[PDB]
């Protein structure tokens, strides 16, 4: 039962770090088997906020959007509230209604796809499943989550003799060099749940398909959805009967999913691993919310928000803050940007690049550092999961008890690796517990109206801030209108909080503090590293834009 | 019993991944078929196991296979300072496609960034981004849009595994799919043809399902085939109320914008 743990002391850098998106070079430094010190090295600089400059303020979402297209539509979302927000337009509720459920839909696909083929290679033993007896498989999954077919012995064994003709072909294709192959003491898994999972990882490739198609009902596609305007949304088709009936029942059965295989598989994970819920804490956490009743500001969207925004400092669970959206800035000190642009609140933005050389400690990032009132912040499931539990938020207490129960573990643990991995499943499992209510507004809305886009007139000079709360947490763009053009264009984005630099002050982010202690079993395999990593859901694009 | 699907080596560069998530939306065939049956992936940092030295080592071991690999760039090459602002394993993004490059069997560029230079090629280009031909002076198989459609990627591959090099237009791109422009195939070409136009997306014609051209819509200029095979099996732009931004013309980020305009 002690968590392996080699001797080793000396320095670990993992370029690239794989199964997330973009480009991440994570640099450690180990002693006596655990981690000393970290650097989360961001490898990839775009600049869109640079080629926005001058541009047409109609045309940010559809840059914007382009900072990711794993999280494809949230920047759009935020590129249009900020919008919204300059030209001083309240979008029609109808409006409000479709690009919430986009977000829904959203949020389904990504935490899917993130669990299963992002995450779970780094728990589960893919050649082990090899192993497995899949009976005593078929019966493990029977006593641990619903009955259904594919988790029959027959189905199990298919998956089986799949991954034996693969594995035995030769070319192991993404699993050559896995850190599992031949052996490896930080899984830990008996073989039936390998063979569980790996079964499940195939299914998700198919069931993202039905999400992403989901979501594509109403953003006309994915990725990259094409369906916000400025004062609102275009796709009258969207609010129709026949549309939302297959909206309805293609998210039907990707929550089918959810509940039959991702929370049961999490759960049996977490059970096995249940050290990694005192591995990789943070202390701080922000939301602005996501899934508001009242988007009419973005004041409105903070305080109606019914994922509920928030700021927690301390670990301290009783007291929520209010967000002062005055006191978010960003540092560059430790970042590949000119000196003296510390300290800027985003519409103060300043985006000027410049390069050092690799692994020079005193600039190592391409991402911002972006602070709050001094302090670093995590964003993303975790940190709403915190704060809804803390406010009572009755699906969210629900949803965290019966896993806190699952598990036998207080709300404590969650501040840990194993904890932000389950607040991911929590809160697509409350997603889905809301999409047949959120579903069934729409349609009752789209029936009795039509309004979907808001009248509106371009300022010649103004200011505005669009927030949401994507997949990975806390986003806001912060426009500056002057002559009808965009003057300054900032993104402040999950992956910024969450992995970028040290701030002015030398200290350091959430995963940079995340990766300190981490147990190393072999340091030339260091599955732990990616454990933790993988667990923040990075997207360096995102994260830098 | 020796047994080789051909490899498949996959780059990203400067990218959003959103081409690798459009390429996994693929239902003919599915992707586990895909990579299970018909081709070898060896080296995709977005879904593949290894990381860091093991997954720089996977690459090599691709890119020396004695059976040869076919290229799959996705992203644009940042070329300033020396590449350095784009960069996988403490080497340029540059450096590792033209190596990559020069002893590819073929080379499919996934989206308009690695055809094209895409959106951080966008005036004034920061990064100096450039498309994989233009870096390179490579001849490329061009699968723009952004993303493009499954459809058009996976085609291609399957195309370029089983029959050869499909015939190309003179932007690099497949005339299978990209022979046509959206327009010619726009279910609301008949109201563009009787000249009747939303003016607004508040308006009653836009309601209606009137021609998106006034709003801005660059269907009339833009070689894809959105509206006739759809995303997702379900929509495409216009169907969704919104013109059309010309993703997969290149350089579209400057030559299509004012989006909302007729520039
Ligand atoms: S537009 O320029 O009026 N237009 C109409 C027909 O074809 C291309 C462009
Ligand atoms: S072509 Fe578009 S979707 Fe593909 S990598 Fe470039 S920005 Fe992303
Ligand atoms: S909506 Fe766009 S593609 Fe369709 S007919 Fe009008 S201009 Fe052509
Ligand atoms: N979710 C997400 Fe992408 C990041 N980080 C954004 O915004
Ligand atoms: S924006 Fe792109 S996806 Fe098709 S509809 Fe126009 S070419
Ligand atoms: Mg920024
Ligand atoms: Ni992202
Ligand atoms: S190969």
Redesign the interface.
């Known amino acids: 039962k002690p968590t392996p743990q080699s001797t080793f002391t000396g320095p670990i ?11 991440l ?1 994570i640099m450690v430094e180990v002693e006596n088997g655990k981690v000393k010190d970290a650097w989360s090295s961001s ?6 906020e ?2 926005l400059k001058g ?2 303020p ?2 940010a979402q ?2 914007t959007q ?5 999280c ?1 539509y949230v920047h759009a979302l935020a590129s249009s509230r900020c919008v919204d927000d300059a030209v001083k337009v309240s979008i029609p509720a109808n409006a409000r209604m479709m690009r919430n459920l986009v977000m829904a839909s959203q949020y389904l696909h990504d935490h899917l796809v993130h669990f299963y ?2 995450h779970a ?1 780094d728990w589960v033993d ?1 050649t082990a499943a090899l192993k497995a007896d899949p009976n005593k498989a078929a019966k493990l999954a029977a006593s641990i989550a619903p009955a259904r077919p594919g988790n029959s012995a027959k189905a199990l064994k298919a998956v089986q003799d ?1 991954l034996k ?2 594995v035995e ?3 192991l ?8 192959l031949g052996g490896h003491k930080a899984y830990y898994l008996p073989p039936e749940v390998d063979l569980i999972a790996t079964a499940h990882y ?1 299914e998700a ?2 069931m ?2 039905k999400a ?2 989901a ?10 959805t ?4 400025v ?8 609010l129709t009967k026949d549309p939302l009936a ?1 909206y309805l029942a293609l998210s039907k059965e990707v929550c089918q999913f959810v509940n039959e295989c991702y929370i049961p598989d999490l759960l049996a994970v977490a059970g096995f691993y249940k050290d990694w819920g005192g591995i990789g804490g943070t202390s701080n956490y922000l939301a602005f919310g996501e899934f508001a009743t009242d988007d009419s500001s973005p004041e409105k969207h903070l305080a109606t928000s019914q994922f509920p925004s928030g700021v927690i400092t301390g670990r301290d669970l009783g007291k929520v803050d209010n967000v002062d959206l005055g006191a978010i800035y960003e540092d560059v000190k430790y970042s590949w940007y000119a000196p003296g642009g510390d300290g800027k609140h985003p519409y103060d933005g300043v985006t000027d ?1 410049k ?1 050092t050389k ?1 692994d020079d400690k005193d600039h190592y990032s ?1 991402m911002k550092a972006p602070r709050y009132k001094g302090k670093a912040m995590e964003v993303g499931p975790l940190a709403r999961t915190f704060i809804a539990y803390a406010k009572g938020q009755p699906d969210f207490k629900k949803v965290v008890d019966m896993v806190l129960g699952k598990l036998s573990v207080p709300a404590t643990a969650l501040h840990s690796t194993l904890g932000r991995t389950a607040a991911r499943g929590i809160e697509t499992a409350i997603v889905c517990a809301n999409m047949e209510k959120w579903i069934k507004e729409m349609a009752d809305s789209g029936a009795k109206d ?6 509106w007139e371009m300022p010649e000079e103004s200011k505005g801030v669009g927030l949401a709360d994507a997949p990975r947490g806390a986003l806001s763009h912060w426009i500056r209108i002057k002559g009808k053009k965009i003057d300054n264009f900032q993104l402040v984005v999950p992956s910024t909080w969450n992995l970028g630099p040290r701030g002015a002050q030398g200290d350091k982010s959430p995963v940079e503090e995340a990766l300190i202690g981490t147990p190393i079993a072999d340091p ?3 599955v732990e590293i ?1 454990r933790t990593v993988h667990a923040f859901d990075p997207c360096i ?1 995102c994260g830098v834009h | 019993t020796a047994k080789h699907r051909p490899s498949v080596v996959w780059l990203h560069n400067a990218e959003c991944t959103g081409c690798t998530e459009a390429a996994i939306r693929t239902i003919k065939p599915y992707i586990d078929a895909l990579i299970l049956d018909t081709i070898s992936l060896d080296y995709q940092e977005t879904i593949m196991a290894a990381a860091g030295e093991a997954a720089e080592a996977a690459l090599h071991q691709a890119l020396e296979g004695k059976d040869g690999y076919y290229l799959v760039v996705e992203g644009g090459l940042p070329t300033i300072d020396g590449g350095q602002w784009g960069m996988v394993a403490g080497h340029p993004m540059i450096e590792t496609t033209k190596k990559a490059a020069a002893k590819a069997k073929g080379i499919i560029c996934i989206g308009t960034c690695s055809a094209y230079g895409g959106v951080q090629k966008a005036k004034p280009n920061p990064s100096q981004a450039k498309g994989v031909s233009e870096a390179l002076g490579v001849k490329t198989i061009n699968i723009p849009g952004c993303p493009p459609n499954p459809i058009n990627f996976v085609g291609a591959v399957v195309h370029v595994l089983t029959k050869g090099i499909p015939d190309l237009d003179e932007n690099g791109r497949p005339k299978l799919f990209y022979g046509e422009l959206v327009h010619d195939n726009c279910p609301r070409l008949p109201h563009f043809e009787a000249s009747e136009f939303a003016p607004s997306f508040d308006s009653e014609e836009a309601k209606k399902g009137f021609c998106l051209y006034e709003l801005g819509c660059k269907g009339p200029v833009t070689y894809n085939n959105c509206p006739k095979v759809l995303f997702n099996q379900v929509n495409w732009p216009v169907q969704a109320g919104h013109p059309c931004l010309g993703c997969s013309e290149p350089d579209f980020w400057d030559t299509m914008t004012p989006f909302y305009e007729q520039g």
């Open positions: 850098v993992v370029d690239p770090i794989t199964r997330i998106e973009g480009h070079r490898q990839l600089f775009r600049g869109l640079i080629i541009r047409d109609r045309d559809h840059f382009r900072a990711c297209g794993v494809t083929h992002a290679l893919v799949k003709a693969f072909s030769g070319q294709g993404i699993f050559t060099n896995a850190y599992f195939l490739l198919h993202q398909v992403a198609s979501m594509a009902i109403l953003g006309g596609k994915n990725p990259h094409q369906f916000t305007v004062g609102g949304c275009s796709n009258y088709q969207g297959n690049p390069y690799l391409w039509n309004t979907l886009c808001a009248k030339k395999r260091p990616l694009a």
